[model samples]
Target: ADNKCENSLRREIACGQCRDKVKTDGYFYECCTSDSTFKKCQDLLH
Candidate 1:
């Protein structure tokens, strides 16, 4: 069964890092988190 796109990706540590960056000047945690998730998803696909 291959339902790759149907499933969701999750990240805990990265989310925590983003939360800690709340109300800060110039934030990349969200973007970085997305990048991290994307990489993880790619790994799952391959």
Candidate 2:
């Protein structure tokens, strides 16, 4: 469950909208690498 929550947090960070917000924090990760990244993240949460 903790790992899942961590991934969920990561998934949000990689999103376009959230990415912009986190830019100032200097945090980066492989989230939306492709057009399907968003969809893939969504599926991971489920």
Candidate 3:
């Protein structure tokens, strides 16, 4: 679970949306990465 959380957190940070407010007020592991980084989240997260 920590790995998953950390990975997602990095994605959010790299995309410049780590401060993104919750849209649904529920738990989620989503990437708000910009179009430029969306494709390479996996590469960058590692």
Candidate 4:
């Protein structure tokens, strides 16, 4: 699960399971060298 969410973060995919929130909800990670870091969370229980 951690791996899944972490990968989601790398891909900018908001994963509630990982406690990653959204800027009004969003996605689409990219970049030729940079990675998308997820921000905010739900108490980060995990």
Determine which window of 10 residues in candidate 4 has minimal summed lDDT: 24-33
Q: Give the TM-score of candidate 1.
A: 0.27
Worst 10 residues of 3 by lDDT: 18-27
True lDDT of residue 18, candidate 3: 26
Which residue pairs come into collision in candidate 4? Answer: none
What lDDT score belongs to each candidate, Candidate 1 first?
Answer: 0.40, 0.44, 0.40, 0.32
Better of 1 and 4 by TM-score: 1
My TM-score estimates for the predictions, one after another, are 0.27, 0.25, 0.25, 0.17
Ranking by lDDT: 2, 1, 3, 4
lDDT of 3 by residue, 1-46 (tens): 3233445555555434322332331212443524443345445434
Candidate 1's C-alpha lDDT? Answer: 0.40
Model 1 C-alpha lDDT per residue in residues 1-46, reported as the tens digit of each score: 2222224534433333444444232343443345544454334434
RMSD to true structure for each model, in Å: 9.3, 9.7, 7.7, 7.8
Model 2, 1-46: lDDT tens digits are: 2232245455564453444554432322434444354555445444
Model 2's alpha-carbon lDDT is 0.44
lDDT, model 4, position 22: 32
Count clashing residue pairs in model 2: 0
Q: Pick the candidate with the highest TM-score.
A: 1
